[PDB]
Amino acid sequence: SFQTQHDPRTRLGATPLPGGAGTRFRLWTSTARTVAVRVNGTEHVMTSLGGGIYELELPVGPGARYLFVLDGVPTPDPYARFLPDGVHGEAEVVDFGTFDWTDADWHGIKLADCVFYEVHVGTFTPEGTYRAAAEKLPYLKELGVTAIQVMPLAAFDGQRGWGYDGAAFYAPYAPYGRPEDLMALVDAAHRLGLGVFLDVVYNHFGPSGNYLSSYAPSYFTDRFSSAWGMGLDYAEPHMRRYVTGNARMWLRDYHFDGLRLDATPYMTDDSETHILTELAQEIHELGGTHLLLAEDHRNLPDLVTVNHLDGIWTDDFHHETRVTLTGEQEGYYAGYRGGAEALAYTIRRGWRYEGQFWAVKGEEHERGHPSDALEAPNFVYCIQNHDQIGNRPLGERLHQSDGVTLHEYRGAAALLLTLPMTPLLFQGQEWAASTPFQFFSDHAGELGQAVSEGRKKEFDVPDPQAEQTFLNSKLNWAEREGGEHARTLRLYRDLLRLRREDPVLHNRQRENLTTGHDGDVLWVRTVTGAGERVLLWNLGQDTRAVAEVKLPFTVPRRLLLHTEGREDLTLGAGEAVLVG
Numbered sequence: 001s002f003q004t005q006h007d008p009r010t011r012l013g014a015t016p017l018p019g020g021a022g023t024r025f026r027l028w029t030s031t032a033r034t035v036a037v038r039v040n041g042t043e044h045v046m047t048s049l050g051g052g053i054y055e056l057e058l059p060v061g062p063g064a065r066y067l068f069v070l071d072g073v074p075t076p077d078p079y080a081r082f083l084p085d086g087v088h089g090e091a092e093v094v095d096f097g098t099f100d101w102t103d104a105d106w107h108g109i110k111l112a113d114c115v116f117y118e119v120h121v122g123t124f125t126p127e128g129t130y131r132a133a134a135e136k137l138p139y140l141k142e143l144g145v146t147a148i149q150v151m152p153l154a155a156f157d158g159q160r161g162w163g164y165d166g167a168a169f170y171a172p173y174a175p176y177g178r179p180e181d182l183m184a185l186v187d188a189a190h191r192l193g194l195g196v197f198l199d200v201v202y203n204h205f206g207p208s209g210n211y212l213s214s215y216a217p218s219y220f221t222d223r224f225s226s227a228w229g230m231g232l233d234y235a236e237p238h239m240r241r242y243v244t245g246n247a248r249m250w251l252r253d254y255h256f257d258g259l260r261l262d263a264t265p266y267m268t269d270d271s272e273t274h275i276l277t278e279l280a281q282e283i284h285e286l287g288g289t290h291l292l293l294a295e296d297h298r299n300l301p302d303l304v305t306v307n308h309l310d311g312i313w314t315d316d317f318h319h320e321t322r323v324t325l326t327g328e329q330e331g332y333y334a335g336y337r338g339g340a341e342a343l344a345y346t347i348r349r350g351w352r353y354e355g356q357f358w359a360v361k362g363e364e365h366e367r368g369h370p371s372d373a374l375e376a377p378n379f380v381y382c383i384q385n386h387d388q389i390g391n392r393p394l395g396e397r398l399h400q401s402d403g404v405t406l407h408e409y410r411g412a413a414a415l416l417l418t419l420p421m422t423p424l425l426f427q428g429q430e431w432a433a434s435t436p437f438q439f440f441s442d443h444a445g446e447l448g449q450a451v452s453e454g455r456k457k458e459f460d461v462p463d464p465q466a467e468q469t470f471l472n473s474k475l476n477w478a479e480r481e482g483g484e485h486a487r488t489l490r491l492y493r494d495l496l497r498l499r500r501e502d503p504v505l506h507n508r509q510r511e512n513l514t515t516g517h518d519g520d521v522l523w524v525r526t527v528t529g530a531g532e533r534v535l536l537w538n539l540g541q542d543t544r545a546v547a548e549v550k551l552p553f554t555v556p557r558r559l560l561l562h563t564e565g566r567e568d569l570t571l572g573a574g575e576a577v578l579v580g
């Protein structure tokens with residue numbers, strides 16, 4: 001008995017009409033006195049319906065170019081489905097019904113079956129497009145990942161960017177390709193049995209290209225702020241529907257399997273039904289098997305158990321692992337000791353902070369909640385992602401940080417990919433890629449200069465606005481063929497195959513997972529009806545024989561995988577083994 005608030009008949013923007021009758025244009029404005037649509041250069045006055053709603057039907061079809069004219073001012077459509085000339089230009093009318101999908105036998109993917117692979121379309125290939133990315137899908141399938149996690153695609157200003165400056169949420173960023181190129185990428189992924197997930201940003205709009213306030217200032221509020229402007233007012237139903245209609249488009253019209261919601265703590269809403277709950281209702285109304293994940297630092301199980309999201313990106317594991325390997329203590333890393341004992345605890349508890357004091361200077365509070373309600377798949381774990389690489393001054397990867405060996409890097413992979421939690425890898429991680437992932441942008445004018453200055457002051461640091469910073473972040477695919485890159489890749493393939501094939505690692509219950517330590521050796525034990533596995537990781541500087549590790553059970557005898565391919569049950573510094 002939840003009923004969607006959305007009806008194609010009243011859809012804001014430009015929507016093709018049935019029977020080849022053309023396009024219906026609709027907008028909401030609280031302040032304009034005159035309202036017109038300019039289509040292929042010709043202006044037509046729109047009909048006032050009440051409630052600030054304006055409408056017009058014209059015989060123009062998909063491909064027509066338009067914007068709205070508010071009190072004589074040409075203004076881009078916030079509901080644009082494509083912006084071929086960028087965020088300050090005319091929109092194109094898009095018809096989602098003409099693409100020939102071939103994925104009728106694809107029925108989504110469960111979270112417990114996801115191994116995420118985070119892609120940035122612009123850097124993932126030389127071309128930096130969907131079409132070039134699609135040619136890497138067979139590689140990803142063979143690698144053994146099961147779900148692609150795409151960084152944000154909403155149109156933003158400039159010729160490159162991470163995606164978090166998105167401003168026109170319904171319009172896929174034109175430099176990556178046209179709408180049908182994105183559909184082709186999803187269709188190709190589904191053919192190979194891969195899920196595709198999209199990063200969406202419903203806590204803020206980027207600084208350039210967001211014209212919502214030109215239509216109605218009340219989309220936003222001064223009660224609080226975003227990084228770029230006034231806060232998104234979820235007490236305003238039109239604002240709620242902007243984001244729920246967007247989520248529905250990505251899932252229904254582009255066939256995405258799920259969404260990753262950026263910075264959910266900053267989707268502020270005091271409404272009786274929280275916007276996160278309504279998002280879940282609205283996407284579930286579509287009647288598929290779509291997933292919703294939250295990027296949330298609050299260690300708050302209610303996101304799953306009350307808002308009915310599927311899982312949470314939970315960084316305590318990542319942070320505990322990084323501190324273990326580097327000793328670093330700047331910023332939020334000061335929240336963690338690291339080490340075998342510490343890692344055993346964080347895994348045991350899912351996340352570390354369950355209400356205890358977070359003593360990080362500038363952020364002091366009682367952080368988190370008991371994790372008991374959450375099951376292993378509800379936690380998304382990683383040792384690398386876009387933020388944990390790119391928010392570093394030089395954008396260096398884990399194996400490129402001072403004091404980290406390739407042996408330690410490979411051990412960390414074994415830990416991540418044998419846990420029952422839902423893992424995520426960042427593009428190129430699997431071959432210990434040589435290239436950084438730096439923060440880059442391409443804003444115009446004074447805003448561009450402010451970005452460059454802001455980055456300098458925050459922390460030489462690579463200028464985010466420089467072309468070189470973007471190019472230096474491009475993946476080098478050929479390097480995976482050789483040397484330590486190939487060795488690391490061989491290990492990732494072996495780990496992913498085992499995750500897939502090993503009947504005990506199929507465990508997805510925290511009841512069946514225990515952890516502990518002996519000195520600097522971490523152990524992780526899984527026991528099910530199918531048998532027993534133990535992962536031992538030597539986080540020390542010395543060599544440790546598995547037979548001398550003190551354990552509260554008898555260690556299994558069979559060596560299933562050693563991260564350095566050794567024959568004997570001995571762990572050099574940083575090395576790991578899986579036994580059964």
Ligand SMILES: OC[C@H]1O[C@H](O[C@H]2O[C@H](CO)[C@@H](O)[C@H](O)[C@H]2O)[C@H](O)[C@@H](O)[C@@H]1O
Pocket residue numbers: 107108109110112113114115146193499500501
């Ligand atoms: O929903 C798609 C399929 O998901 C599962 O299979 C995928 O995920 C597994 C666990 O990560 C992988 O081992 C496997 O290679 C993938 O195909 C599920 O087992 C299938 O029944 C689903 O059809």
Ligand SMILES: OC[C@H]1O[C@H](O[C@H]2O[C@H](CO)[C@@H](O)[C@H](O)[C@H]2O)[C@H](O)[C@@H](O)[C@@H]1O
Pocket residue numbers: 167205206207208209210211213214228229230
């Ligand atoms: O039409 C004026 C400008 O409106 C938008 O910019 C406002 O909203 C941004 C947040 O999305 C703020 O960062 C900015 O300071 C505001 O002016 C739009 O993004 C701009 O392109 C317009 O010029």
Ligand SMILES: OC[C@H]1O[C@H](O[C@H]2O[C@H](CO)[C@@H](O)[C@H](O)[C@H]2O)[C@H](O)[C@@H](O)[C@@H]1O
Pocket residue numbers: 300301302305369370373
């Ligand atoms: O304030 C947020 C919520 O806090 C509690 O829920 C969390 O902590 C509980 C135990 O203290 C757990 O049982 C629960 O799974 C956590 O989400 C409180 O019980 C909730 O009502 C609050 O919404």
Ligand SMILES: OC[C@H]1O[C@H](O[C@H]2O[C@H](CO)[C@@H](O)[C@H](O)[C@H]2O)[C@H](O)[C@@H](O)[C@@H]1O
Pocket residue numbers: 323324325326327328337338339340
């Ligand atoms: O060497 C001085 C530091 O010793 C500890 O930190 C080391 O040991 C931790 C495990 O207990 C590792 O996670 C960490 O990477 C090491 O640097 C101590 O915690 C630090 O406060 C000391 O400065």
Ligand SMILES: OC[C@H]1O[C@H](O[C@H]2O[C@H](CO)[C@@H](O)[C@H](O)[C@H]2O)[C@H](O)[C@@H](O)[C@@H]1O
Pocket residue numbers: 263297315316332360363387388391
């Ligand atoms: O994880 C605790 C911190 O979470 C948020 O910080 C960021 O999340 C990533 C690091 O965990 C960052 O790289 C990203 O830029 C933020 O979303 C929170 O903002 C911090 O205050 C916490 O210390």
Ligand SMILES: OC[C@H]1O[C@H](O[C@H]2O[C@H](CO)[C@@H](O)[C@H](O)[C@H]2O)[C@H](O)[C@@H](O)[C@@H]1O
Pocket residue numbers: 503506507508509528529530531
């Ligand atoms: O496929 C989801 C479950 O897979 C495993 O459990 C299955 O196989 C077990 C053999 O050890 C049986 O005990 C169990 O009845 C089967 O569901 C995995 O161990 C579970 O955690 C998953 O939920």
Ligand SMILES: OC[C@H]1O[C@H](O[C@H]2O[C@H](CO)[C@@H](O)[C@H](O)[C@H]2O)[C@H](O)[C@@H](O)[C@@H]1O
Pocket residue numbers: 341344345515516517518519552
């Ligand atoms: O309360 C002190 C510690 O108790 C646990 O650790 C002990 O028991 C584990 C399981 O037998 C062993 O792995 C470990 O070596 C013992 O010290 C708990 O796991 C730790 O977090 C506590 O610090």
Ligand SMILES: OC[C@H]1O[C@H](O)[C@H](O)[C@@H](O)[C@@H]1O
Pocket residue numbers: 269270274300302
């Ligand atoms: O901090 C936790 C709380 O944050 C927000 O106020 C949410 O609306 C509420 O559901 C949640 O309990």
Ligand SMILES: OC[C@H]1O[C@H](O)[C@H](O)[C@@H](O)[C@@H]1O
Pocket residue numbers: 362363364365
């Ligand atoms: O200092 C105020 C702190 O309180 C909070 O609830 C947030 O978790 C933290 O990010 C913030 O900095």
Ligand SMILES: [Mg+2]
Pocket residue numbers: 518519550
């Ligand atoms: Mg000992």
